[PDB]
Design a protein around this ligand. Structure first.
Ligand SMILES: Nc1ncnc2c1ncn2[C@@H]1O[C@H](COP(=O)(O)OP(=O)(O)OP(=O)(O)O)[C@@H](O)[C@H]1O
Ligand SMILES: Nc1ncnc2c1ncn2[C@@H]1O[C@H](COP(=O)(O)OP(=O)(O)O)[C@@H](O)[C@H]1O
Ligand SMILES: Nc1ncnc2c1ncn2[C@@H]1O[C@H](COP(=O)(O)OP(=O)(O)O)[C@@H](O)[C@H]1O
Ligand SMILES: [Mg+2]
Ligand SMILES: [Mg+2]
Lengths: 506, 456, 88, 147, 81, 456
């Protein structure tokens, strides 16, 4: 019942002595930028302390004044107020205690579940592991989508861009990629930049309804929050993701709008009066995203043994990134999209014309690419994805002949229906991630010709019923494929016998 | 203490105060003699504040004494505001004398915290076929009417007000931001003659008013809606044009000493929009249901202002100039309009399949249009000829006569229920009306009236 | 035969959906019961701490000064504790 | 432009009687405006044209293709619109001109779609024929007004 | 055909019963946690106000002894610091 | 002497020096107690200089002491740089210890004078058939490399690196302008595994480095190449992407506040390209030949960056995804790839006629393939079917097993001479090999090897 008197006992054990501090005075306040006079020893990036527990960061160390940006609300600050050096750079809490929690860009809890118990803090701005400390990407990151996992595979330590116009499934694809990690071993981070607070709450409510929240850290910097917090949020989330990578483990990070981070950095720059370039962005907007995205990496066993000081051995850690960018009317030639397309390892392009034509996942497989490729796939998916590529390519070449299918040559007419049946197989539902064995049944059935007698309109109910059949009569075979995604003549014969038996009675 | 005007340039005014008496950001100031209010926007330094006039400056001079009020603009709130017309400063702009206020709130406020947000999917029926089908609204949700000049934003909003506000049991706030003074007069006489003025608070800031007035009118109307939400009530908030708030910031931004960004916009476009939009929400105490009309400069949806607005709304209704140019109203684009409620778990599988079925036919017709123009219609397959006929029927069955548009058309208005809409579109997709001509579906209501129209 | 097989599978799919949606209403029913009772339990306990905290607030004020200045404050703490408790 | 154009208005009997100190009673007063704007090669996306179209109670779009095609009044009925509508017309013109503009707007579309198609139904032929007659009727000479 | 239809239906109903149970445990856990964190939130919120009032008393208490005894001790101590 | 930091704005730093000790333009400065290098860009006057940090500016403060070095950024040169990875400043980024350097050279110098140019055009024999026939490279020339990923770009660079060192006693330098850290690690291991690492010096400017590093890496790699040329060698300079060199210049120009030019590029675009490209030439001692990968913005060849670069290119090698599917691993497109050296007044009438003969037959076959597909193989004349047979033999004879590709091809590598290349294609054009099967002309090297592969 009584707690106030004991927490006060600790307060009587805190320093009451004088301390030498380096100070300054506020000269002007406008649009979130407070200009200060004094602070002769302040460092570029240091946090300034203002009256009222408000903090800022020094960004323009000019000869006669300091231009500082508020990491909170600046409408209470005024001319003549005192400003103090802290001697510290910006740091955020890190560790497993953040899993299943919603925090602001500074690591403060916003979910109302109580204080965080983090045992360590780390710097938001850090350099990425150098060239010689890395290891090639050769481990998979399954997203649960047949179109992405079969044709645009993502590996542990890769950076894959999700690019496309507004309202076409960009957020859905990244949230489902996080949901699929609840049993994988990969910890997940979702960073919300410039979103409305009710939208972030619908994603967290969907991470909880799907059992994925306990494996995810949610970092939020909503649309009403300071441009400095929106600019810093991706670096704070990256720092929380780097804990697991540097200690021998694997993590996944989603930056829901890098284009909104660029817009927030442009606001601060034009208000500090920095020289403008194309689309009014500052001269270092490429360096902004590049400094962030080069941290997503795979590090060697020698880096993990050096960092852990021997504690962790034989394990390679990684941080995989799924940055999201919005294009205006399909214009990929815009300044920010051009920069990020050149920084990333691959791109998943979503299209409005495909999305309106019922192709729900909307992945344009003709232009989407993964430079890591087959190295990021298990043996079974790598063997069944080769023909899927040929059939869709043939369908893109022969799509005008559908209105003249009668007049076509038989060989070409055979290819045309195969292309149309493989195209209908790629369609999937939201919040329905598929496992390696369940994806393998669908890809095997199409690639081995088991769909030639199924009307293009019944391909989906055939897939749904086939998976349900194998989940009842072949549970041991699905469990075997799900161990490592292995393939051999016994698994090939086993799947064939089950599909033949399925068609013969179901 | 007291300040002196030192620099007047257009709508922006600089006032110099003692260096120990500098007024706060967003603080309201009053000019001596002249009846003018100035809001501090920036503290330049040396006791000087930069402010924007909430009136005209034709009578202002250098050296006029200015008084610090110690607070931001305080407007009247609560029951006393119902059935009254007011300006940005909260003064009554109707001849009914003073308002009996029992409290005044400051227009500037923090957005509700992350723990205060509330989630609800109660379906709200509008009575319009296109919206009830592809853009189902939700109680407590945010709706946006996107469109250029002359496509129906005001008309559609008036129809909704009529099909929702009139029946709504709770109160309502109507904010006319950068609106035509003629529309405000027609709406006031309409609410007064309909006996509904008793449950509607009216705040007006039209195009003839100074930039500062058009920049804060939205915060005044929202402050009145927030008082009612915080009392535990269910409220309706209608904003005539929220673009005028962004534009007033563009008109004044350069005089405030800010460098311009892309498409000549203020560098604070996304933050100024987020600070307003995050307050228009339904918390755990009460629910604000809001409809905003969003102007699209030169019909280009990629313009920074419209493009930054989509992320703040639950329901996005898009009006197309190409459909309006064919005499089809409501001019809603069924391929660009979207809602968070268009989900099988929320609306049901039958409605969802009918909406996706209509969108598939319209997207396929959009790509066959060029073929038909160059080669002709006989060079199409039998399946394509049938699909083109149904697409043209669906495109005309989305038109609807409205009660607020009878002066423009001469035809009586109609209200279609959601059951009737789904049935009419499911029938056209199925083929139950492949004999009736496409002209029978133009401006009718439910599918029975198309059957009657075809005979005549 | 296959029309009846399809009817058996389709009715089972419908029945399964009803089994889950009834459980959602049952779970919400008990959740609201627990929430209402717990709020009342805490409210009563909150009155007991309200009076107790008033008296100890004066004692906690003197304990901070009571370390260093407490030698001199032994005398002031008697006058200041009775005056501060009565002033609140 | 908004400060200029909001003065053109209709004022109530109460407004006139107050200003005229009781001299004029029972009379409403008005100022109607006809602003003109020039576009470059039909580009309406320019800053000034965009502003003025968003202030007025309607617009009359004149098209160059129509002017060269012989329709000298050149009023594009699909793009032009009045926000006052039937309230600005006498009873006879209000009833006779019912949906003529939206019907002309649909006739211009039907003509292009039926330009190279095989024989269509009576509904299509009748609509296409009525449209070519209303289109020829809307032509008028300069300095020749009609009562 | 009919025996396999009954088998398909049996799995659908068996998994539906476990799914219904699964949502029941998740829903009750949400409400349980919400009430437990509400209790600790009330304790920490009042704790902040109680501290602020105790500090206000300390300011007055300090002022009397601070002027005579502490003014010489503070000035001399600051020169040593 | 030493100066003091007076202003820090991002990567741009201003330093004040005594009036008698102001550092020169492009001079390198060292901050005391921190591993940060500043390159001087402009002399503002009054003792103050504007410089760009060659590293991060986090943790720096005003008033820190700065030391002048007396010269521009000076990097290690010579034999010791082979098989090593270095940054823009010449520091060993690999954990292999200090570089065993005997000399250091500054990265900024004038291009060789009018009198230093070589007396004619000398082809560089790559030993690769398709390149030596259709894309002849001149010594001291610049080659543009076009194509996507996964088409053999890395394998083609490793083969050229092997052949210049083993068949011509030369060396290579690779400049990673805006290098991806993952790809930079993968390329280093692929070259170690392929045994070519001891024949090349690696200079990397990674994407996460400031704009000044990405702009100067091309000059660091070029300075190492200049040293070998002076030794009496023919050298290969590989530039990972020339578009990123242009962009780094645009970024630096914006940071320094210069007024932007057409399409937003720096006003110095043509001069910055000329300063780099004019050092790559054939002198009277040795010759630096360069292979540069080229990126085209928005697929527009008229854009200032592609336009400026193409003005300095002597050859264009295009790698084709289609050709790769056929199975020709080199994957160079014989119809799209071109060279300015393909002139009878330079390579003689015989080489020119043989190359143009191959291109004519391959053009006709691409047209006939559409005929065979649309109408059938029976529709062609006897002369056209004979051409199709020679075209197929030519197409396969353009293939070649590379020594770095033995792991993929399962066969030993081949180095074909220009004489053997011309003789083989001339014979197939004349019909001397019409009796042999086309497969006998696949992955064989010289024409005598096709004869034997057919004998078995
Ligand atoms: N299989 C699917 N995959 C993705 N989205 C789907 C699918 N089926 C339906 N949808 C719906 O499509 C819409 C996609 O919204 P989402 O937020 O993911 O798109 P977005 O491009 O990220 O939008 P925004 O730009 O606002 O962030 C949602 O209504 C979603 O429920
Ligand atoms: N539903 C409708 N029915 C008939 N005419 C309409 C309709 N909506 C718009 N219009 C036409 O356009 C005008 C309405 O435009 P308005 O609603 O003011 O557009 P906005 O607010 O987008 O500028 C009317 O005067 C009429 O001529
Ligand atoms: N000369 C070659 N011989 C055989 N296979 C090759 C050859 N060149 C390319 N390939 C094949 O193409 C793949 C990619 O080639 P690579 O040089 O790495 O292209 P990129 O660098 O763009 O990725 C190789 O791993 C190999 O499978
Ligand atoms: Mg999104
Ligand atoms: Mg309007």
């Amino acid at each position: 019942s009584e707690i106030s008197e004991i927490i006060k006992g600790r307060i009587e054990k805190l320093d009451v002595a004088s301390q030498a501090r380096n100070e300054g005075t506020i000269v002007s306040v406008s649009d979130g930028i407070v200009r200060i006079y004094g602070l002769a020893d302040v460092m570029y990036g240091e946090m300034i302390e203002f009256p009222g527990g408000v903090y800022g960061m020094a960004l323009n160390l000019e000869q006669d004044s300091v231009g500082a940006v508020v990491l909170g609300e600046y409408q209470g600050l005024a001319e003549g107020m005192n400003a103090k050096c802290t001697g510290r750079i910006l740091e955020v809490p890190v560790g497993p205690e953040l899993l299943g929690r919603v925090v602001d860009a500074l690591g403060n809890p916003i979910d109302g579940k109580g204080p965080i118990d983090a045992k360590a803090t780390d710097a938001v701005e850090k350099v990425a592991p150098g060239v010689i400390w890395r290891k090639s990407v050769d481990q998979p990151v399954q997203t649960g989508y047949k179109s992405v996992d079969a044709m645009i595979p993502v590996g542990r330590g890769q950076r894959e861009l999700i690019i496309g116009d507004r309202q076409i499934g960009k957020t859905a694809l990244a949230v489902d990629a996080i949901i699929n990690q609840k049993d994988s071993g990969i910890k997940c981070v979702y960073v919300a930049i410039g979103q409305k607070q009710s939208t972030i709450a619908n994603v967290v409510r969907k991470l909880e309804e799907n059992g994925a929240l306990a494996n995810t850290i949610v970092v939020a910097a909503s649309a009403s929050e300071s441009a400095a917090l929106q600019y810093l949020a991706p670096y704070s989330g990256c720092t929380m993701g780097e804990y697991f990578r540097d200690r021998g483990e694997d993590a996944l990070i989603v930056y829901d709008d890098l284009s909104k981070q660029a817009v927030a950095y442009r606001q601060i720059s034009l208000l500090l009066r920095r020289p403008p370039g194309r689309e009014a962005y500052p001269g270092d907007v490429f360096y902004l995203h590049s400094r962030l995205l080069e941290r997503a990496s795979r590090v060697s066993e020698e880096y993990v043994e050096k960092f852990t000081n021997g504690a962790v051995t034989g394990k390679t850690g990684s941080l995989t990134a799924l940055p999201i960018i919005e294009t205006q009317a399909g214009d990929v030639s815009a300044f920010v999209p051009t920069n990020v397309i050149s920084i990333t390892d691959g791109q998943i392009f979503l299209e409005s014309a495909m999305f309106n034509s019922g192709i729900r996942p909307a992945v344009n497989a003709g232009i989407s690419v993964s430079r890591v490729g087959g190295a990021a796939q298990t043996k079974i998916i790598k063997k069944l994805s080769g023909g899927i590529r040929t059939a869709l390519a043939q369908y893109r070449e022969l799509a005008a002949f559908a209105q003249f299918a009668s007049d076509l040559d038989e060989a070409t007419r055979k290819q045309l229906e195969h292309g149309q049946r493989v195209t209908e197989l790629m369609k999937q539902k939201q919040y329905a991630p598929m496992s390696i064995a369940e994806m393998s049944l669908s890809l095997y059935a199409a690639e081995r010709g088991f769909l030639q007698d199924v009307e293009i309109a019944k391909v989906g109910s055939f897939e749904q019923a086939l998976i349900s059949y194998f989940q009842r009569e072949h549970a041991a075979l699905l469990a075997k494929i799900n161990e490592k995604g292995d393939f051999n003549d016994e698994i090939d014969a086993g799947i064939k016998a089950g599909i033949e038996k399925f068609k013969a009675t179901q | 203490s007291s300040g002196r005007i030192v620099q007047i340039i257009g709508a922006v005014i600089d006032v110099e105060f003692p260096r120990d008496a500098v007024p706060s950001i967003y603080e309201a100031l009053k000019v001596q003699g002249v009846e003018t209010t100035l809001e501090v926007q920036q503290q330049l330094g040396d006791g000087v504040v930069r402010s924007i006039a909430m009136g005209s400056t034709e009578g202002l001079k250098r050296g006029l004494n200015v008084d610090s009020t110690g607070a931001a603009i305080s407007v009247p709130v609560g029951k006393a505001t119902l059935g009254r017309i007011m300006d940005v400063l909260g003064n009554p702009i109707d001849e009914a004398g003073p308002i009996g206020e029992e409290e005044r709130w400051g227009i500037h406020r923090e957005a509700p915290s992350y723990a205060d947000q509330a989630g609800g999917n109660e379906l709200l029926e509008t009575g319009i076929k296109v919206i009830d089908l592809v853009c189902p609204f939700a109680k407590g949700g945010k709706v946006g009417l996107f469109g250029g000049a002359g496509v129906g934003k005001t008309v559609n909003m008036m129809e909704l007000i009529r099909n929702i506000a009139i029946e709504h049991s709770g109160y309502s706030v109507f904010a006319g931001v950068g609106e035509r003074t003629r529309e405000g007069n027609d709406f006031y006489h309409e609410m007064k003659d309909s006996n509904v003025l008793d449950k509607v608070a009216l705040v007006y800031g039209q195009m003839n008013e100074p930039p500062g007035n058009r920049l804060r009118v939205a915060l005044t109307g929202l402050t009145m809606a927030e008082k009612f939400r915080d009392e535990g009530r269910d409220v309706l908030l209608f904003i005539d044009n929220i673009y005028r708030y962004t534009l007033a910031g563009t008109e004044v931004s350069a005089l405030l000493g800010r460098m311009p960004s892309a498409v000549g916009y203020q560098p604070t476009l996304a933050e100024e929009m987020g600070v307003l939009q995050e307050r228009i929400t339904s918390t755990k105490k009460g629910s604000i249901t809001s409809i905003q009309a969003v102007y699209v400069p030169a019909d280009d949806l990629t313009d920074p202002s419209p493009a930054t607005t989509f992320a703040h709304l639950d329901a996005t209704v898009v009006l197309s100039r190409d459909i309006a140019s064919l005499g089809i109203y409501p001019a809603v684009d069924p391929l660009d309009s979207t809602s968070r409620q268009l989900d099988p778990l929320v609306i049901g599988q039958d409605h969802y399949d009918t909406a996706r079925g209509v969108q598939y036919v319209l997207q396929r017709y959009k790509e066959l249009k060029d073929i038909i123009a160059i080669l002709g219609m006989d060079e199409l397959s039998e399946a394509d000829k049938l699909l083109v006929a149904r697409a043209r029927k669906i495109q005309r069955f989305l038109s609807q006569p409205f009660f607020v548009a009878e002066v423009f058309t001469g035809s009586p208005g109609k209200y279609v229920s959601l059951k009737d809409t789904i049935a009419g579109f499911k029938g056209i997709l199925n083929g139950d009306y492949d004999h009736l001509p496409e002209q029978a579906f133009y401006m009718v209501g439910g599918i029975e009236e198309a059957v009657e129209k075809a005979k005549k | 035969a296959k029309a009846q097989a399809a009817e058996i599978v389709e009715q089972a799919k419908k029945r399964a959906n009803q089994i889950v949606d009834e459980a959602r209403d049952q779970a919400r029913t008990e959740g609201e019961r627990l929430k209402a009772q717990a709020q009342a339990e805490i409210e009563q306990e909150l009155n007991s701490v309200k009076d107790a905290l008033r008296a100890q607030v004066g004692a906690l004020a003197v304990t901070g000064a009571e370390k260093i200045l407490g030698a001199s404050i032994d005398a002031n703490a008697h006058e200041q504790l009775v005056s501060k408790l009565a002033a609140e």
